[PDB]
Amino acid sequence: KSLAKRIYEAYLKNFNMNKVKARVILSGKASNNPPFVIHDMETLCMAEKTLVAKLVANGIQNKEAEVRIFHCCQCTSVETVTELTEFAKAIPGFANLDLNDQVTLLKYGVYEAIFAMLSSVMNKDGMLVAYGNGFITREFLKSLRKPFCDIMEPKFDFAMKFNALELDDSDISLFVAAIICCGDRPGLLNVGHIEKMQEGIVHVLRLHLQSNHPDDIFLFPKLLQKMADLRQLVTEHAQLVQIIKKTESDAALHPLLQEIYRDM
């Protein structure tokens, strides 16, 4: 019944960063601990000095900046996968699924949710990092060497249009719930039940969009297509991951992420 508020509360409880918090920082109102702007080699070094001094003490600047940024991005994804798992466990019905089916839903779902949610911490000029205390510019990322400069640019492009829909956290929580509870993931066994789980979530999303955005009459099918865009975005991103597996020596993938990427 009241599936939407349980989903919204699960979202509010399990994600350290969200859109309300992110927009405070991106608008420019974070006066106490404002986001350090990382826009070149030198501001990246200052940021690392202040935010991860244990790492600079261990000679981490003796690695290329691309490798350092890669590692930061890696750790954030690992963190978010953990939050997504706890989020999913709180979606009504999820905890009753077969363990292997739960693994399947997360494996194929986490990165669609990550890049959806990544939009919240993005603006036209850059993205928040380090729990809102850093802001790495879009142009600095483009200025890195191949293939690292190729990773974030399509996410910025997705985020710009997604953000033009002006969703709030209540919308995004249901959106991410629909991404995770997807009945067409390869290898699902209880397809019938997961399909009914998604039918309920998509139903409440539709109702919620109608009352939370009464002006945008076509927002629901727009969001449905954004779901398909994200699957395309992830399939394209997986091949960038593949280029790094093969042709980058000092860019070791975290074990949890290679398990996720093993068969996509």
Binding site: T85, K89, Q102, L106, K107, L256, E259
Partner: peptide
């Protein structure tokens, strides 16, 4: 076991 299973079986 696999790392995703562990996250799902955690307390």
């Amino acid at each position: 076991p696999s790392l995703l299973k562990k996250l799902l079986l955690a307390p």
